[PDB]
């Protein structure tokens, strides 16, 4: 019955508070800890801030954003985590002048790590379903390893709608949500395009998706030089299938990815990363 | 501890560990690599009780960026073990002395390693109550896939709240030889000397008891040109740090916090790209 408690952090211990972004679930700032001498990130606004913190603390694993502690004062309320210096997967894929080249090995490693993380969540007792996966929520650490974030909408099994399966928003309203999101993410990673960019109104997307339309798969979106192209397209297509029952579990998904990741020499990952610097 | 939020360490059935491969055998037990059948990640497992379980409780409570991360325990009539993330690059000890396999070990990496160990030990000392490692050595500093530091082996560690404490002779302060908050810093100093020189401390002496005598008198590892070449970045501020940390007097030894404060500017003199370059050089 081994237990660990989340440390409590005094606000006066957070020096150099600098703004990073404003979001639906609060504001994120970077800082340094006065005693530990490390950079941290702080997300400040209540029941919600307390909830995400408990989830990160219970869901700790190699591919989940690691929580360092909580700031629980009458004057200030925040979640403290390690700092992710390389932003989000969304920025890596779409800031093409800042990152003209993103080598395949790193793209596949990112996909593998996201699957590993969600798999772990689904394998907790009770299972945790993220339900808000998107490229903006996949953070990248100092070495470009994945840390899944934003547990605000996650549910214990007991904005943008491009990553949401049709059954969630059909009129008169799931354990197959995360895999749907993963399929859209995979498509996005392998093409560096925004899904449905050509569609100005989100309701037209929602309507198209409910009718079975999905991001386009052809040579312009997914070029023929993509390593293991057939295997990935096939994984993407089953992942976003109309019928949730036909979507694979993350175990199946990982068993498919494994042989692909074995083809890359370990040094090519390091070379892909230094090319970004 | 705040709000009373708690996290439990998962139990892992032994049969969920596939592909067991022997890695090593030491004092505290046998260490093997494996892959978790459900989680699909490589893991390391240390097997042979209240001792094994004690390390698991410490690792689980002392979770931090530079502390070996624990994933769960095996608690079965058949088997008892500690399951952690696997460290693909072994120990700092192997990096420093396996000169054929690692012909060159760039300075920025060395300094990053020194900084991370200090950050790790500093965090431990700042816990409430504080934790003291008592067995810091190069064999207990593990290196991950990108050569970042994970401090391991909390077997001889103690919370701060009569025979001498345990440890490895060469990294042990002299006042702990017979029947203290300044044990770790002494070990750190010997570690620092070892990192900058790539030499065995007290290499000349074949008899470990002679070492204990010498150290008691006042000798320390050799600080000259032969051991610490002149081309060492900040050789002076470093040699200063080594000597104050391994003082004969426990009270003339600095806290980890003060060491950090000195090391930060030194680390800021290295460009980010030089760390990645050092790592690619090792592969
Ligand atoms: C703090 C926090 C808590 C909980 C949670 O779900 C997310 C965060 N956010 C972050 C955590 C660590 N590093 C980050 C780095 C950058 C950004 S960004 C994209 O610029 O907003 C956010 C970060
Ligand atoms: C499992 C464990 C538990 C508790 C603890 O204090 C240490 C370990 N060991 C290890 C953990 C993760 N990676 C390792 C990689 C290599 C080795 S070695 C040097 O070959 O013995 C040991 C490792």
Coordinates of C-alpha atoms in Angstrom, one line a residue, chain A residues 2-175:
Chain A
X2 CA 3.0 2.3 -0.8
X3 CA 1.9 6.0 -0.9
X4 CA 3.3 9.4 -2.2
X5 CA 1.9 12.8 -1.5
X6 CA 2.1 15.8 -3.8
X7 CA 4.4 18.4 -2.3
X8 CA 2.8 21.8 -1.5
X9 CA 4.7 24.8 -3.0
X10 CA 4.8 28.3 -1.5
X11 CA 4.2 31.0 -4.1
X12 CA 7.1 33.2 -2.9
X13 CA 9.3 30.2 -3.9
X14 CA 8.5 30.8 -7.6
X15 CA 10.8 33.5 -9.1
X16 CA 10.8 35.1 -12.5
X17 CA 7.2 34.4 -13.4
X18 CA 6.9 35.1 -17.1
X19 CA 3.8 34.6 -19.3
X20 CA 3.6 31.7 -21.8
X21 CA 0.0 31.5 -22.9
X22 CA -3.7 32.0 -21.9
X23 CA -6.1 29.0 -22.3
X24 CA -9.6 27.8 -21.5
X25 CA -8.3 26.0 -18.3
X26 CA -6.3 29.0 -17.1
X27 CA -2.9 30.8 -17.7
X28 CA 0.5 29.2 -18.1
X29 CA 3.7 31.0 -17.0
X30 CA 7.3 29.8 -16.8
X31 CA 9.3 30.3 -13.6
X32 CA 12.3 29.1 -11.6
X33 CA 12.2 27.4 -8.2
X34 CA 14.3 29.2 -5.5
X35 CA 15.3 26.1 -3.6
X36 CA 15.4 23.4 -6.3
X37 CA 17.1 25.7 -8.9
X38 CA 15.1 24.4 -11.8
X39 CA 12.8 25.9 -14.4
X40 CA 9.1 25.0 -13.9
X41 CA 5.8 25.8 -15.5
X42 CA 2.8 27.1 -13.5
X43 CA -0.9 26.9 -14.6
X44 CA -3.1 29.3 -12.6
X45 CA -6.9 29.7 -12.6
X46 CA -10.9 25.8 -8.4
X47 CA -12.5 22.3 -8.3
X48 CA -11.0 22.0 -11.8
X49 CA -7.4 23.1 -10.9
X50 CA -7.5 20.7 -8.0
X51 CA -8.8 17.9 -10.3
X52 CA -6.2 18.1 -13.0
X53 CA -3.5 18.1 -10.3
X54 CA -4.8 14.9 -8.7
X55 CA -5.0 13.2 -12.2
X56 CA -1.4 14.1 -13.2
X57 CA -0.2 12.9 -9.8
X58 CA -2.0 9.5 -10.1
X59 CA -1.3 9.1 -13.9
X60 CA 2.5 9.5 -13.6
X61 CA 4.4 7.7 -16.3
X62 CA 7.2 8.3 -18.9
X63 CA 5.0 10.0 -21.5
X64 CA 2.7 12.0 -19.2
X65 CA 3.5 15.6 -18.1
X66 CA 5.3 15.2 -14.7
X67 CA 3.7 17.3 -11.9
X68 CA 6.1 18.8 -9.3
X69 CA 3.6 20.2 -6.8
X70 CA 0.7 22.5 -6.1
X71 CA 0.4 26.2 -5.0
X72 CA -2.6 26.2 -2.7
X73 CA -2.8 29.7 -1.2
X74 CA -5.7 32.1 -0.5
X75 CA -3.9 34.6 -2.7
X76 CA -2.8 32.2 -5.5
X77 CA -3.8 28.8 -6.9
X78 CA -1.6 26.8 -9.4
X79 CA -0.3 23.5 -10.8
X80 CA 3.5 23.3 -10.9
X81 CA 5.1 20.9 -13.5
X82 CA 8.4 20.5 -15.2
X83 CA 9.0 23.0 -17.9
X84 CA 8.7 21.8 -21.6
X85 CA 11.1 24.0 -23.5
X86 CA 10.1 22.8 -27.0
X87 CA 6.5 23.7 -27.0
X88 CA 3.8 21.6 -28.6
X89 CA 3.6 19.2 -31.4
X90 CA 1.3 21.7 -33.1
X91 CA 4.2 24.2 -33.3
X92 CA 6.7 21.7 -34.6
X93 CA 4.4 20.6 -37.4
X94 CA 3.1 24.0 -38.5
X95 CA 6.0 26.5 -37.9
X96 CA 7.6 25.6 -41.3
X97 CA 9.9 28.6 -41.5
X98 CA 11.2 27.8 -38.0
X99 CA 11.4 24.1 -38.7
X100 CA 11.8 23.5 -42.5
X101 CA 12.8 19.8 -41.9
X102 CA 11.3 17.3 -39.5
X103 CA 13.0 13.9 -40.2
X104 CA 10.8 10.8 -40.3
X105 CA 12.5 9.0 -37.4
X106 CA 11.5 11.8 -35.0
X107 CA 7.9 11.8 -36.5
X108 CA 7.5 8.1 -35.9
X109 CA 9.1 8.3 -32.4
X110 CA 6.5 11.0 -31.5
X111 CA 3.7 8.8 -32.8
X112 CA 5.0 5.8 -30.9
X113 CA 5.3 7.8 -27.6
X114 CA 1.8 9.3 -27.8
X115 CA 0.4 5.8 -28.3
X116 CA 2.5 4.5 -25.3
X117 CA 1.1 7.3 -23.1
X118 CA -2.6 6.9 -23.9
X119 CA -2.1 3.1 -23.7
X120 CA -0.8 3.5 -20.1
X121 CA -3.8 5.7 -19.2
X122 CA -6.3 3.2 -20.6
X123 CA -4.5 0.4 -18.6
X124 CA -4.8 2.1 -15.2
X125 CA -7.4 0.8 -12.7
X126 CA -9.8 2.3 -13.2
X127 CA -9.0 3.3 -16.8
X128 CA -8.4 6.9 -17.6
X129 CA -9.7 8.3 -20.9
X130 CA -8.0 11.6 -21.9
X131 CA -10.9 12.7 -24.3
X132 CA -9.1 15.9 -25.4
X133 CA -6.1 14.8 -27.4
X134 CA -4.9 17.3 -30.0
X135 CA -1.4 18.4 -31.3
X136 CA -1.6 21.5 -29.0
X137 CA -1.7 19.1 -26.0
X138 CA 1.3 17.0 -26.9
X139 CA 4.2 18.8 -25.3
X140 CA 7.9 18.2 -26.2
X141 CA 10.6 18.1 -23.6
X142 CA 14.3 19.1 -23.7
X143 CA 15.1 16.1 -25.9
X144 CA 11.9 16.1 -28.0
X145 CA 10.3 13.3 -26.1
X146 CA 6.5 13.4 -25.6
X147 CA 4.6 14.5 -22.5
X148 CA 0.8 14.4 -22.8
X149 CA -0.9 17.4 -21.1
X150 CA -4.4 19.0 -20.6
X151 CA -6.3 16.5 -18.4
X152 CA -9.1 19.0 -17.8
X153 CA -11.6 16.9 -19.8
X154 CA -10.3 13.4 -18.8
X155 CA -12.7 10.9 -17.4
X156 CA -12.2 7.8 -15.2
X157 CA -14.0 4.9 -16.8
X158 CA -16.7 3.8 -14.3
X159 CA -12.4 25.2 -29.2
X160 CA -11.5 22.8 -32.1
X161 CA -13.6 19.8 -33.0
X162 CA -11.3 18.2 -35.7
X163 CA -10.1 15.5 -33.2
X164 CA -13.6 14.6 -32.0
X165 CA -15.5 11.5 -33.3
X166 CA -18.9 12.0 -34.9
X167 CA -20.9 10.1 -32.3
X168 CA -19.9 12.7 -29.6
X169 CA -21.7 15.5 -31.4
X170 CA -24.6 13.8 -33.2
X171 CA -28.1 15.3 -32.3
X172 CA -29.6 13.5 -29.2
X173 CA -26.4 12.3 -27.5
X174 CA -17.4 6.5 -25.5
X175 CA -14.3 4.3 -25.0

